[PDB]
Each structure stands twice: as C-alpha cells, then as structure tokens.
Design a protein around this ligand. Structure first.
Ligand code: CA
Ligand code: CA
Ligand code: CA
Ligand code: CA
Ligand code: CL
Ligand code: CL
Lengths: 212, 212
C-alpha cells in the first residue's frame, strides 16, 4: 500500500541494524535468523522469563541437560534425541550452549510448530493422524511427499502422533535444513545456490529414507 | 608389468562387453557396479546356489521378506531395517525385487564387510569394540571421523558390535552412498562432479548426525 495509516515494516529496517551488527556472526549467518524479526519487543520479556525457567544453573545459557529437563510452551517436552536436534539447529557456535537469542529462535520455531499442530489435528484433537502430517509440514515450508510423511509418522510416533512427537518431526526436518546449509557451504559443490524449497523437499525425502 | 607370465586383467576388458551391454541400464549406471567384475566365474555357481536358498518362492528374484528371512554367508542375518537398506542399495530398478546380478553385488559387498570385520575384531574375536569401527569403515572406503564412528556404534549396536550390527552399519553407509548418487544427479546442483571419497566422508559424517 501507499497508505499512511497502514504502513508495513520492511525487512532489514534501519532501526534494527544496531542490534543486528552486535549479534554473533554465527547467529546472523544461519538459515533461521529471520525468525528473530518476527518477535515483538513486548514478547521479549515473556520469552526471557521462559528461558530463565529452563536455565537451571543461571548461566545465561541453555545446555542439553536443561533442554531434556525443560518445559516449553504448550506443554512441549523434548526427548534426549530431540534435545540434541535442537542443539544442532540452534547452537550455531557449536559451543554446547544455546544463548538467549538462539533460544528466542527455538521458541518461535516451537510456537510455529505448535500452531500448525492445532490447525491440522482435525480428525482427533491433540493428535495428528498420519495423513495430517503432510499438510502440516508443507505449511511450515517442508515440501515432502506422501511416502515421506508416512515414514516420518512411523519413525517418530503408534496410531496417532502427539504434540511432542510432532515437535520431534519438526526438529528433524529443521536439523536436515541446517545439514543442507552445511553441505552446500562446502566449496567442492561449487558456488552456493539460493535456497529452493522444492529442491530441499526432495533432499528431505531422500535423507528420511536413510532413517530406516 | 610388461611380463608375459604375469599379465593383469584390465578394467573394461573387451571380453566382458557382451555381458555388460545385455545388463539393465539401472545396474550398469550404479556406483556399486565394479563389484561385479571382482567375481570369478567359478564363484558364480556358489552365489547362485545361495540365491536359490534365499529365493523362497522360486521367482528368480529376492523380495524384502526373503531378505528378512534369509541366511547369508558367515551366519549374517538382516533385521527388517537392514533388509530395507539392502533393497534401497541394490534394487536399482526400484521395482521391489533384487535380480541375480543385483544379489551378486550384495553378496560381494557382504563378503568385503565380513572380511574387514574379522580383520578389525582384534580386542575380542566376533565383536567390534567402538574404536575398531573407524578403521574398518576407512578400509572399506568410508572416510568418517571418530565422532561419527562412535555415533554409528551407539546407533546400530551395547558394549560390543556383533557381525550383524556391523553389516547394519555398512548397509547404512552404502545406502548413504546411493543417496548421494541420487542427490547429485539432480540437475539443480550443476554438472555432476566425479566422486571424491574424502568429500563423501564428510557428507556421511553430516547425515549420521541426523540419525540422533
Ligand atoms: Ca544454563
Ligand atoms: Ca552456542
Ligand atoms: Ca523370490
Ligand atoms: Ca530390482
Ligand atoms: Cl505426494
Ligand atoms: Cl578422526
């Protein structure tokens, strides 16, 4: 719009630059960084309060044991496997710690996943049946096929897939996205191509098949 | 040598061409095809006898249930997961059948893996301890790192890794090789680069991390 009363924020607004330049390069370079600009300041304090509840030794950081022990929004809990996936996604420094800014990303990611869970649990509230996994993952940007969606339900769930199992699936898909980023940063594979969600979906189908 | 008495066979000898051109394109195009030229004719009949023992419905082909039920050389047995990996490696036609030529490859692969198992089970006969997995896989051509070798022992074994568990590991590494072949055949990633075992080793490290 060119309407004065309805002006939308632009990506990379000058007002955010101060904050952005102070952030660690690892954080700024990562595929999930744009999650950070979706969070209003007024939710900052809520997320920070949550962070404090998970940070059991008050280190100002989250370690894998804290993720395994933590309660997250919507009653989400993480198995040891899933806590490790969250570390591999969000500890972009590879130091074994999740910083507050890294947790903010993880929190938003979990809230996106939770929203799609509730939206796609239509046959039975609080569970995803196998046929609901495909659309929920597509909505999140993971363009997989039916074969793959049924394989993920089988690997990560039982009849139905509860919220925790859904978050496990989403963490696997996101860790594969990080792995993809790492692989294609290797200069052996030529100049880095822009991300193509359809091509990445095919990559995710293939890597999923390696899990069985 | 230029010695008449000690002439070595050359790869792609004219005498094998008749056979090679009659083979299905899927088989000829696959990364494991050179396994086939390592098998002398006199072992043909032994492998065929073994094939017949696994082929329970005499279809002239092996299906996944036959792999799950089959006994292979060295007392090797395949879990459901590993039988499926063997299908993903060797059913290059994607028809759900392993042909005799596809089984020949699988048999040779298993014999290579079995030989390295016996060679590397030094601390205790009939088992690989975690530190023996790294050299055995390097000997097979899979250039992984220590982190990865210990992750594979953890994922696929217990204290020690028996033969069947080792074959499971080898099948995972080989299925990842097939996956790599498939991924890099996609024209999105540019002209296909020649295979580089060191670069592939790094790829295997990364994909291994996705299994936990
Ligand atoms: Ca802490
Ligand atoms: Ca970190
Ligand atoms: Ca059969
Ligand atoms: Ca076949
Ligand atoms: Cl589909
Ligand atoms: Cl190493």
């Amino acid at each position: 719009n060119f309407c004065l009363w309805n002006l939308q924020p632009i990506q990379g607004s000058w007002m955010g630059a101060a904050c952005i330049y102070q952030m660690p390069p690892s954080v700024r370079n990562t595929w999930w960084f744009p999650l950070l600009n979706t969070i209003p300041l007024d939710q900052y304090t809520r997320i920070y309060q949550w962070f404090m509840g998970v940070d059991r030794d008050r280190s100002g950081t989250l370690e894998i044991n804290e993720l395994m022990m933590g309660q997250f929004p919507g009653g989400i809990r993480l198995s040891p496997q899933t806590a490790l996936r969250m570390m591999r996604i969000f500890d972009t420094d590879f130091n074994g710690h999740i910083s507050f800014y890294e947790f903010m990303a993880m929190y938003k990611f979990m809230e996106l996943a939770y929203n799609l869970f509730v939206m796609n649990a239509r046959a039975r509230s609080g569970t995803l049946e196998p046929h609901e996994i495909l659309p929920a993952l597509q909505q999140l940007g993971f363009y997989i096929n039916q074969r793959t969606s049924l394989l993920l339900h089988r690997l990560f769930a039982m009849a139905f897939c509860d919220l925790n199992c859904w978050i496990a699936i989403c963490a696997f898909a996101a860790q594969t996205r990080s792995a993809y980023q790492m692989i294609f940063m290797n200069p052996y594979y030529g100049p880095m191509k822009p991300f193509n969600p359809m091509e990445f979906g095919k990559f995710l189908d293939v890597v999923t098949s390696l899990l069985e």
